[PDB]
């Protein structure tokens, strides 16, 4: 089980997550749900996520990322999940 830091927790809650403690599988699930709630993926190139000007981009340190190269996402999670 992991406990997200507050900015990441707010993202998960905005996507429908409840509580403070999660499995990594649950964190990944609600990050995907957040990207869809905020409509951050490109409808015409659906592996591309454009997160500039969103809190998610601020945590990632990126304007965009691809689901085919999730390395910046994993770097963020390592920094923002307390295990």
């Amino acid at each position: 089980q992991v406990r997200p830091k507050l900015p990441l927790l707010k993202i998960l809650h905005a996507a429908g997550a409840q509580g403070e403690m999660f499995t990594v599988k649950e964190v990944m699930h609600y990050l995907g749900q957040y990207i869809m709630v905020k409509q951050l993926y490109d409808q015409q190139e659906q592996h591309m996520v454009y997160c500039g000007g969103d809190l998610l981009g601020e945590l990632l340190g990126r304007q965009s990322f691809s689901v085919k190269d999730p390395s910046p996402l994993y770097d963020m999670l390592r920094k923002n999940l307390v295990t």
Binding site: I35, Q46, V67, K68
Partner: peptide
Amino acid sequence: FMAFWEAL
């Protein structure tokens, strides 16, 4: 999107 995301 979800087809790709759930494949991680």
